[PDB]
Design a protein around this ligand. Sequence first.
Ligand code: ZN
Lengths: 96, 7, 7, 105, 573, 571
Amino acid sequence: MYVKLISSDGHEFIVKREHALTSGTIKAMLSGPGQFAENETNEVNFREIPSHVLSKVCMYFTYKVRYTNSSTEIPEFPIAPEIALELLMAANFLDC
Amino acid sequence: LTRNKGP
Amino acid sequence: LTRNKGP
Amino acid sequence: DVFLMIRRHKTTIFTDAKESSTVFELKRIVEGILKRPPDEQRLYKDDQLLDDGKTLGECGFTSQTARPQAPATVGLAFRADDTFEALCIEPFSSPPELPDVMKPQ
Amino acid sequence: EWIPETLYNTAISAVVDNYIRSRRDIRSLPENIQFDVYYKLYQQGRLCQLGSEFCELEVFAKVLRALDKRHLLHHCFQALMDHGVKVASVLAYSFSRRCSYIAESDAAVKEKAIQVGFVLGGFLSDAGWYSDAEKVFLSCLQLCTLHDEMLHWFRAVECCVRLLHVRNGNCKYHLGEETFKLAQTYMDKLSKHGQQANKAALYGELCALLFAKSHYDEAYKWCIEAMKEITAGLPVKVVVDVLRQASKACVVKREFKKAEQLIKHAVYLARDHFGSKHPKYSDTLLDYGFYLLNVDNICQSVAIYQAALDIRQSVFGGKNIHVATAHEDLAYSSYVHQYSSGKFDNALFHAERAIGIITHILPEDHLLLASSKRVKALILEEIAIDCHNKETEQRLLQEAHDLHLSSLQLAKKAFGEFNVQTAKHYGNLGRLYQSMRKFKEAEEMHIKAIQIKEQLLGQEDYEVALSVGHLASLYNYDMNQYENAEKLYLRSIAIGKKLFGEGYSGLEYDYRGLIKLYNSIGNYEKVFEYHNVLSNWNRLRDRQYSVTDALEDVSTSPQSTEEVVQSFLISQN
Amino acid sequence: WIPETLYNTAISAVVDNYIRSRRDIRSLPENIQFDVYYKLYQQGRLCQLGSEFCELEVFAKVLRALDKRHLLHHCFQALMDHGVKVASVLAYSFSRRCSYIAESDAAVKEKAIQVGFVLGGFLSDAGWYSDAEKVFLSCLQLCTLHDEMLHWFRAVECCVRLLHVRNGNCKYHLGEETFKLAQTYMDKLSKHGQQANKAALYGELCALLFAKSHYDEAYKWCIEAMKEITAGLPVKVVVDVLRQASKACVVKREFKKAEQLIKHAVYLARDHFGSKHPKYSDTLLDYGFYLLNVDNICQSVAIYQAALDIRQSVFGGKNIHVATAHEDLAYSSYVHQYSSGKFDNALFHAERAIGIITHILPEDHLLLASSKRVKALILEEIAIDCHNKETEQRLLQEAHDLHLSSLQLAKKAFGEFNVQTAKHYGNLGRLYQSMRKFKEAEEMHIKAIQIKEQLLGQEDYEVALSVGHLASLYNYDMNQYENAEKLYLRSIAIGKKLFGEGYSGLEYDYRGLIKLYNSIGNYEKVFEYHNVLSNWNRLRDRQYSVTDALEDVSTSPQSTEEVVQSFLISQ
Ligand SMILES: [Zn+2]
């Protein structure tokens, strides 16, 4: 029910599996040989994604899952200008 | 002219 | 209308 | 609802909890994830132990400072049967130094 | 003379010609130098190099800090908006996005952001971008109402006195009442903690809100309150705001003696502190032209409105809502002045250019069209009935019908069914249907306007007098119902004579209608005596025509602040 | 309320922090770069978007996003409406690049040609033919310095695409030389035992000769083009050749073949490219040309308007591609509502065409001749419907100025002996008839007949229309009934031969003959012409049955080689 989005630095980001399948790429990486990990939580190595930006990716997962089909007005995702470019390439690669 | 100006 | 449309 | 990042050394649990829920349910979540007893878990809210009796709302976590966009971090330590251990939360990384464009140079 | 060019001005030309290689280093300049390079880029026609820097919040922030060269900044900013780049919305979006990220920061960064937001939103409000200034002030209010500290209520109410200003100009009157309530809530929280804030600005903007919503009975009370809240320590801009808006609220409630005092003092203060080429002085000239229009001093209102427009075409540029308001106000004033002369060339030119601006910078459903279109649909009427052609007359009346219908639809959408603006549109449609030979619809629209104006404004008012004049001009000249036309003419002449003395312009229209009324039925003694009254009217009008120009009629320092205010307040009892 | 994607959120953040990362956006992947620049467009930052799109290095990576090309064509257009001359700067930058790498190896020379081909194709698709011609001239120079097989294929393709940008820009004198140079390169290819396909080149030559009103030789050359279409051709080439062959068949009075040709072209464009593609809008424009020349007029307005709405969505205002749709829809709406007389939508599309073309093209350019003609035709027909003499004598004066301008352009380009200048003469004859000028209208109409009879045959559509105009001038105006009767009979016979008894132009001839016989005698002819006019109205009641030509084409009518073979076996 939880996946372990390990970044390039080494920071494991144990986020819920339902949160992780927000991104199509993580869903693909958890399908096939990626789901064969028997040790409960699946580890998804991200040697190209640094930890400081994968943390924002996981925050976006927990943000979009909680704010999906919301009846009230929705706030924009707080994204820092100094991380915006790195999180843009992280959003393309993850297709989220 | 027959009327006044317009409001 | 006495003639046709212009070419 | 309250959103937390339970960080111990490099792990970062992106879990959620109710504002009226207590610390025992959060330690049970960590049971469900890192399979560790709650008696071996001391949770730190910025260098401050959370007693198991109190709730998440009382100790400082609210639905305004711990939004899903920017969840509020909480520490974690493991006992290993030897007087527990100190908090060793490792910061993620340094984003590349993007200087102010209008700085005189 | 042939003076050599200043080395400062010569180095500006050299730096601009080397602009591409030195884009990053011009940002590293003093604020006075950085403006002059950008103003030279505007002067050289390189608006796209200018626009690539003014889209940025923090480059534009230092450009905004040059307070003396704010007219030049307004001119180049309007040039960029006419260029095609949407710098007003880009700066608002950039401010909101960069400003929502420091909600949890320290007080110094937050107050710096609030100061920058006040400067930028005040610029966009002065420039006329009220939709793009609301977002800036909304973000400012959001950051003010975060911490429970003393000065945050002061900054919050200072945000709310400007949200209410940029919502009146944006015709968002339904958010205005809730903005007033929220500002009053923070004033209550200020009063509980022993810190009374000045209520002149908020009450003035509420008066403008209620005057725009045609609530003159309550707007007069609120401008009384605003004038009571004028102190000596107020900023001159706030005092001028309260004075001009109270004068507009007094002239609409037939308090002409008070209104001239307030508006002449406002014009004197605007010309004193700001100058003769400031946008705020042009605002006072517009309200003074409104006064002069509403006290039958039409010829001075035309020259006063032209002074307001010439200032607004100087500080601002082309497609701006302030120039559009100056145009739609001068077009109506020229329409009134040349109503008898029939030379609607300048009036149509100003009305057509007013709509040509609002249709370009505002959505098609905005209320500000409903005024301008109305003015055009008046002028296009009078040109059509003056033209001897039937095809052009029919086409122009159909176009005026379209404009009146659109304006009335906007009035229905915003103000409702029983508003004074709706009654004005009904009166205009009745006049048009009288010209359109649709007599039944003409009298229906006219009598509906009579009902709406009588039940809301009152029996003894100018608007109902003008509307009964229209109705009985339809009855007498056209519909040939000679019985009640006499009653409505007597009512119209009574109200006009009691309100404007014996020199009211509509008196001659009413007198000619009454003379035709009698000559169609006989009673030549009435015709003779009312021909004598009309001759007296002509003898009085040309005597009072020779009055000096209204720009210098206010003189230089005739009275002072807290004397005009006191003279207005002590006679309120 | 749905959350925005983290991709879109970061696109918003990178744009907002633009200049601090404006040199780092160029390090992003190509699709991300296109999304950043499109976000600069959406926010209204046209100044920075123009500052980046004027750079060839930035724009070449933008051109790689093919699936979002329909956005780019729009964005580009806004920049060309913003005042920033993006196309001219890009063409000059590419010419400078080629001049710099004139002496280099072929592995980097071929790279710039492929960058040059995509950029020139973009500018040709966008309609900047005067700016796409510099890019293709630079590419042709790069193919010209060296002589080998691959450079010969690149030179052939570059002369094919250079012929297209010299046709929409209306430079036919250079177009013939371009075709001769292309033929030289294909001869050099053939002498080395290698044959390159000539379908696209001969299709562009058909367009060249159709524009120069050489309808017979254009028909011969589109037969030559269609003789060499296989399954290996790109869809765009097949569509272009089918469109040009259909137009040549239309002006060659072969309405039967052009039906299947243009219908298969429209289906092919709607299938491969979709219903919102500029090439499909071109096919719809040629289909409307077909439907307007068939006398299926009421349908044709529904096809030009469909063509215009695609060209107005893919391309913004102030573009030659949306202006050509404007001038073609303005003519057809004038033609469709000629009997009704409600030239309100027709005049709006005519003034929009000239209001664009005068802004993006020089005053002496030939596209003004085809645009000023339509507005002047609408203005002349409007003023004879209004009763104001002072307005009629002003609108006819303006139409006189526009006809003289169009005639000057046509005589400067095509010469005095051409079909285009002759239909301008016929339009001037109609206008002079409306101007109450008798002898001048007669001279103009006689000159129109003289030029349109020899260059189109004795029984063509255009010459029949001009004979009808001259007959109306002799009948309703000059009272020369002895010649007007023969001219009316000739026009009726030709219209019956080409179109049948459902021709909409026969009403103005039947009523003319009715009036003439009313005022000369033989009332037994008047009664039977009333009977024939009633029969014509009853037949037009059924011929007026409105359908959708987008459903007349339907789905999967024929095969690609089937239509070509059917056209070829019928000579
Ligand atoms: Zn620009």
